[PDB]
Amino acid sequence: ITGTSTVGVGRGVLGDQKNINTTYSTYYYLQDNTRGNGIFTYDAKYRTTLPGSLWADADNQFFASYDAPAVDAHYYAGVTYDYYKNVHNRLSYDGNNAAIRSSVHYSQGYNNAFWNGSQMVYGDGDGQTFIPLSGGIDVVAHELTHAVTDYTAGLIYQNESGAINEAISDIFGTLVEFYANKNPDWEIGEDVYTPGISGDSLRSMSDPAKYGDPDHYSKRYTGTQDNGGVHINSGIINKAAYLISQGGTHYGVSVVGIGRDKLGKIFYRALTQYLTPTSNFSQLRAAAVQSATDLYGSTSQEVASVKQAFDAVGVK
Ligand SMILES: [Ca+2]
Ligand SMILES: [Ca+2]
Ligand SMILES: [Ca+2]
Ligand SMILES: [Ca+2]
Ligand SMILES: [Zn+2]
CATH class of the missing domain: 3.10.170.10 (Elastase; domain 1)
Incomplete structure (x- = not known):
């Protein structure tokens, strides 16, 4: 008006x-x-x-x-x-x-x-x-x-491309939560979920398995519910993003964390320059590696950590 x-x-x-x-x-x-x-x-x-x-x-x-x-x-x-x-x-x-x-x-x-x-x-x-x-x-x-x-x-809203779509929304939802800097965390929806239960959330990026979501490609869902698991298999990518930012050792694979700001730069570039409607998880890994190469150099820690994180979640 x-x-x-x-x-x-x-x-x-x-x-x-x-x-x-x-x-x-x-x-x-x-x-x-x-x-x-x-x-x-x-x-x-x-x-x-x-x-x-x-x-x-x-x-x-x-x-x-x-x-x-x-x-x-x-x-x-x-x-x-x-x-x-x-x-x-x-x-x-x-x-x-x-x-x-x-x-x-x-x-x-x-x-x-x-x-x-x-x-x-x-x-x-x-x-x-x-x-x-x-x-x-x-x-x-x-x-x-x-x-x-x-x-x-x-990204088409089904199967692996759809799980990437979902993870992108969880990743940037979380990065915006950190930007505003009020009780930020790597959980999704905690402020509005289950008012009668404290300490829970709808999904966890730091430990997807807490709510039954996979944290490794070998645990991916391949049935038809939820558009082929778009809110389920997003856990594999959410975990990779969490590891890139925060580091950790997951299924024996150690990742050197590079922090939230660099995570956001890498994934924003991947989303806007490299991913396509049909990208799968392997193609996301390649897009993230290329994005980190563009931003930080092929020999950088940032590239090495992206590779570590995708290795940790079983995505080659
Ligand atoms: Ca009023
Ligand atoms: Ca919070
Ligand atoms: Ca949150
Ligand atoms: Ca709750
Ligand atoms: Zn969504």
């Missing part, structure tokens, strides 16, 4: 106060004009029609329980935009400052979030498996990263 840029205040899903960029024209809308061609947050009103209505508020204060998922979807989309711009010199998901749209209050009791080809979509959860999913910065960044993937490598 046409209007003037304003600054509202509210509370997110976890009860924390934050400022949000809004637009005033009769109402205050969740429209942040400070980033690219805008970040826009919509109310799906417990239905499944998308996007729903651009979020309108009479007073620019967003402290109601109903407001909290919208506050966080809007704010964390801004953090994710900032990460891609400041860290990777990428302007929005398309590289040309496309408007970023999210809808909250999608459906009833909806235990998921997704990118629908055009926008992000967040359920409220059923209150037991999840609370509203936009409360997780790793979740928001996971979803926006699907848009980045779709505009770049275009």
Whole structure:
């Protein structure tokens, strides 16, 4: 909408106060004009029609329980935009400052979030498996990263390419969580998963097997559920990425860690210069090795560590 840029205040899903960029024209809308061609947050009103209505508020204060998922979807989309711009010199998901749209209050009791080809979509959860999913910065960044993937490598959402797609979203979801630097970890979704159980998460990158996901290629799933295991076999790549950053010895193979920033540089370059829609895990290894070679040199520690990490997870 046409209007003037304003600054509202509210509370997110976890009860924390934050400022949000809004637009005033009769109402205050969740429209942040400070980033690219805008970040826009919509109310799906417990239905499944998308996007729903651009979020309108009479007073620019967003402290109601109903407001909290919208506050966080809007704010964390801004953090994710900032990460891609400041860290990777990428302007929005398309590289040309496309408007970023999210809808909250999608459906009833909806235990998921997704990118629908055009926008992000967040359920409220059923209150037991999840609370509203936009409360997780790793979740928001996971979803926006699907848009980045779709505009770049275009990894098909099935089998190995789809597991790479998923891992890219978990990797950058985690790197955005570290960028914001509030309780960062190598777990996925811990802030919104199972409010009655402390210390758990939906997936672990540091130890995928904690939640039954493979941490070695010899343990990959090859059935048909979950699009051929895209959220399962992502554990093999998540583990490799964790090892590249943090190091460790895994199935007897030692990896020298190189840190998160270099992990992000290597995987961003692989995603945007080397991966294709049909890349498999072996092709990802080759893309990561080439990316590290471009950035750091063929004789570098960074190249050696990429090779170590893929060896550790059984990917040649
Ligand atoms: Ca209000
Ligand atoms: Ca965390
Ligand atoms: Ca996390
Ligand atoms: Ca929990
Ligand atoms: Zn995903």
